[PDB]
Design a binder for these strands. Structure first.
Ligand SMILES: [Mg+2]
Lengths: 186, 228, 319, 228, 228
DNA sequence: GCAGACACTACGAGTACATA
DNA sequence: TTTTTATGTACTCGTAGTGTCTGC
């Protein structure tokens, strides 16, 4: 900045006035906050018997049913809507779930399985190599573990872990680590 | 050892047939499609001195394209492969040979029951017209004493009735009558001239294209008719 | 007093209000809009309402008309990233030699596939805010990214109070009466206008459309009232047969509605919902869901609908 | 019958108006956009010797570009279009006449309400300035004795009041006052000098461009004004 | 008034520093980058008779090229820029001053801490070898008497150690060393011989290039070594 | 007369929906 | 108070690669 004066502009003004569209793209990606949802305002109405009209709100049978399926008191209604409610309207689905699900303040955290990304990768590798289903692959993994041939088999299969395969293994970019984990597999 | 850019451009074409390739000691490379509908071979200049199986050939060639042309390629001490060039060094995992589909045996193509030739310009015109006329199959036959290639759109013409394209390749001189059908999807060859050897016996047969870089053999379609 | 555009032949397009005072809005919304027009400068505004025909585009243009702004009306679906890089920058950076505030109206900008462009727009707002303002209108507010919603005054149309609704409906009755008088439509019974207003609320566009449709013979009398207060797709015969447990009439009605099974089942559930006990609501939705789930599975469809009728007639507890 | 390059360029320009064309035996070709915005007629050197409808004119011109310029176009024995080249032959499908939107008869333009003339240089300057200032609509009107074309950008200027371009053709000795708005998208003609006829009768109107080889009728915009 | 092709060429070169420009009445043009890192000034022949801010200079110069060389330039009654030709007229918009960045005053270059000169051959060779070897950062330095300009690659080398190119200009007389690092992004000058002045103080610095038509001032990077 | 400009296509990302 | 099932199909947007013609 040769001109040592200037009130100085923000990054957006510098990007736009200069018409450097890469700086404009970065400034726009600055606002790339993502993932907005208000499904739990609907579920609360189902749980707390609040008044709530879905004639103007977005509805999700999968999200509503999976949220209500976290507590056994609602499992009868979720089961019924999972059997005979698939061909119902979203309004009808919501109406039934309000009429049937018993009242209760039950909000909590969903039950999610925490997986060994390395073990998932090993099972997927064994299923790809031997063209078997998932449980057959797990049985192969058990047999190769209790035989000591697993380091040998993993060594023979280390070349099969392409960078697209790791996308199927796990979306966490820390997948790079497993990559090195598989590079050092001897 | 380094891979000259002609070797790299050839391997990029060999990746169009098979996603991986197995390189064995010698000045000769080959690959075949996993379904066995096309196979390729090529005598290459750069000497291959150690056997190495590459499962991901396109990613390997992307690694190659980045770090110079005089890149020294070898196998690493641990068991993988190494690519060193002045400023950098990259390690690539060496796959087990059983993880890559290899043609195992160099197919000795029999003495051709029909021989012809096709220039690079003729092949380019044929590919352009096929991209234009939606042509997906070709039929090499003998028409009025010459050897012709008729291009059909098998989708809208399941029986190959209406000829959409026609090309002449010279006289035949022989005494046999044939109609070798070739699906255009099985021709992964790079532009250039090609000596075309069509062989058939009973229910078996093949079409070999000897080019200025590599030879590509392709399998005929099911309802090909000949009288050899 | 009323705004008439002689270029338009469609009634709802001919009588589009041109001033904030002419629009029929909630009291607080109209107060805020009058304040905006009085203070002279227009901020960045987002007018949204999922219910169509409440007045978003009308109010945007009326704000621009009251402020006497240099308005650039743009179809939101055409406001792609190149439009922001080009026409919007060209309009923002152009010098104004008349003191008119520059305002960009982006009508119906709630397309998800434009999110990226919207992000660019946000950055645009941080560079040319001193030169121009933006009035976005939308139906799906979630189609507008969160930074845009946060940077603007977000006004939710079609969300009135009960007294607001009474006042708005009286104003709409008066406006339809004035439209009839301008159009040469004789009003023999104001109950027709009242029924139209109450039936098509809060969609005013659809209200004027219904007025144009039912005012075909030029007179709004008791016949048009009976036509408006009617339901042409009413299912009442099936509902009354179920209420009476009339097996003969249900057996007769099964083939009448068996042709459009999906639509009839939907409408029948929708109608039974409001006329039965909560536990009857549970049972009705279970019965209807099962019967519809086995639609393509059953052999005789008319028999399937009669089976549904028998189930409902037996298990329903009508309030 | 060969196709001189002028004929093929004219056919391309016509293809920009309608994806398909219906050309009958003679030396007269015509086309009209499916949305009825522009119409074109022209005489050309090459002689059409058989009636045939082309569904995809652009692809036909592509396959024509794919062979020698002296290629022979005829009607195949099956009824399609046979393009005979040196060694190759291309068979292009003949479309069903009902599946191509074409004018029924050459529409005779009425007696003009105003007449002027556009030099090819003025038209080229107008097009290049339209690329420049991004003007998307024009207005043929009168400016103190002369006939002028005003060029507006309807995206940023919706009322067509901020004139971005102005061109002066000839003078207007009549007594009428008119303002014919034309959308730039409907200017599908090739460069050249054009006698510009303008017809309007209350609600009806059109703008004809007479060239030495082709005539182009263009529909005016709905909100044009005149007192004829 | 008009604009000669050399004036338009100077403006087109200035457009590489800023997409817009500010013109005040006189015969002196100038511009600044938005980040203030580079600057340009020029004494030119043609006369400026009305102040105006231009939003897009490149399109303006293109539109000037679309008309004749004797195109009259003036200010329309609405405040924009009128460009009158023989029969055509262009109305280019005038920009708001708050949307274009302009140097508020001609910069006063201080006493030159060091001086040298550059022949046009050295400049064109430097530009070509930078484009070739991918040089992104340069630095002026003193060796055993002569002043030279070296160039590395700041991306591959954050410490500035590998001298990938160097060029010799003249001899240095003095007692102080100076290794000034400058980014290539602020290097937009037309080819020719330039009298190079260099000023430094404390962590700040500048380099002026005086030419026959224009002068170009370039800032220095933050961690530049001064020793003054 | 050849860089550059203009247009066209191929592909990744994001969204949406039906059915199981 | 939390928050996403697999497969197949369809659409839109942005951009980058690519081919091809042309203006001082
Ligand atoms: Mg609207």
């Amino acid at each position: 900045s040769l001109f040592k004066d200037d009130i100085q502009l923000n990054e957006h003004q510098v990007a736009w006035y200069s018409k450097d569209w890469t700086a404009v793209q970065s400034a726009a990606d600055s606002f790339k906050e993502k993932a907005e949802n208000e499904f739990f305002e609907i579920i609360g109405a189902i749980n707390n018997k609040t008044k709530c009209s879905i004639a103007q709100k977005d509805y999700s049978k999968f999200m509503v049913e999976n949220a209500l399926s976290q507590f056994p008191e609602c499992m009868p209604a979720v089961y019924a809507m999972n059997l005979i409610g698939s061909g119902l309207s979203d309004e009808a689905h919501f109406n039934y779930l309000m009429a049937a699900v018993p009242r209760g303040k039950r909000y909590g955290k969903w039950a999610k399985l925490v997986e060994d990304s390395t073990e998932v990768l090993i099972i997927k590798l064994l299923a790809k190599r031997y063209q078997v289903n998932t449980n057959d692959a797990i049985n192969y993994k058990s047999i190769l573990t209790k035989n000591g041939k697993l380091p040998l088999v993993l060594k023979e299969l280390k070349g099969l872990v392409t960078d697209d395969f790791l996308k199927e293994v796990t979306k966490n970019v820390k997948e790079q680590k497993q990559l090195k984990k598989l590079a050092l597999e001897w | 050892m380094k891979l000259s850019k002609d070797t790299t451009a050839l391997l990029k074409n060999f990746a169009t047939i098979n996603s991986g390739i197995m390189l064995k000691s010698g000045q000769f490379i080959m690959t075949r499609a996993v379904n066995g509908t096309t196979y390729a071979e090529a005598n290459i200049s750069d000497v291959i001195d150690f056997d190495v199986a590459i499962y991901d050939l396109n990613g390997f060639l992307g690694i190659l394209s980045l770090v110079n042309d005089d890149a020294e390629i070898s196998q690493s001490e641990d068991g993988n492969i190494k690519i060193a060039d002045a400023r950098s060094t990259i390690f690539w995992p060496a796959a087990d040979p059983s993880t890559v589909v290899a043609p195992n045996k160099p197919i000795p193509f029999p003495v051709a029951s029909a021989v012809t030739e096709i220039k690079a310009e003729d092949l380019q015109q044929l590919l352009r017209v096929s991209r234009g006329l939606q042509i997906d199959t070709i039929a090499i036959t003998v028409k009025e004493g010459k050897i012709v290639i008729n291009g059909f759109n098998k989708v809208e013409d399941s029986a190959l009735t209406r000829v959409k394209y026609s090309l002449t390749l010279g006289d035949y001189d022989g005494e046999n009558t044939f109609n070798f059908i070739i699906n255009m999807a099985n021709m992964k060859m790079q532009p250039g001239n090609y000596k075309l050897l069509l062989w058939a016996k009973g229910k078996q047969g093949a079409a070999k294209f000897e080019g200025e870089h590599a030879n590509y053999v392709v399998a005929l379609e099911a309802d090909s008719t000949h009288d050899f | 007093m009323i705004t008439v555009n002689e270029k338009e032949h469609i009634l709802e397009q001919k009588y589009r209000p041109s001033t904030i005072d002419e629009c029929i809005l909630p009291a607080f919304d109209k107060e805020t809009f009058k304040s905006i027009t009085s203070k002279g400068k227009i901020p960045h505004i987002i007018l949204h309402s999922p219910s169509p025909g409440t007045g978003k585009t009308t109010v945007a243009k009326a704000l621009c008309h009251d402020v006497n702004a240099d308005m650039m009306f743009v179809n939101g679906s055409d406001c792609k990233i190149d439009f922001v890089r080009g026409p919007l920058t060209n309009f923002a950076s152009a010098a104004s030699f008349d003191g008119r505030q520059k305002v960009i109206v982006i009508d119906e900008f709630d397309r998800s596939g434009l999110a990226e462009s919207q992000r660019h727009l946000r950055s645009f707002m941080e560079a040319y805010s001193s030169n121009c303002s933006i009035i976005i209108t939308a139906n799906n507010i979630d189609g507008i990214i969160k930074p845009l919603q946060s940077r603007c005054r977000v006004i939710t149309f079609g969300q009135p109070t009960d007294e607001d609704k009474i006042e708005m409906m009286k104003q709409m009755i008066r406006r339809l009466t004035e439209i009839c008088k301008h159009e040469g439509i004789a009003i023999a019974d104001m109950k027709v206008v009242a029924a139209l207003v109450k039936k098509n609320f809060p969609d005013f566009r659809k209200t004027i459309g219904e007025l144009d449709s039912y005012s075909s013979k030029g007179v709004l009398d008791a016949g048009i009232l009976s036509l408006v207060t009617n339901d042409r797709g009413a299912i009442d015969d099936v509902l009354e047969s179920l209420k009476n447990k009339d097996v003969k009439q249900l057996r007769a009605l099964a083939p009448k509605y068996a042709a459009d099974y999906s639509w009839f089942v939907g409408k029948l559930a929708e109608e039974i919902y409001s006329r039965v006990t909560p536990q009857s609501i549970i049972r009705m939705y279970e019965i209807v869901g099962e019967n519809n789930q086995y639609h393509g599975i059953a052999a005789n469809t008319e028999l399937h609908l009669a089976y549904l009728f028998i189930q409902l007639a037996c298990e329903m507890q009508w309030k």
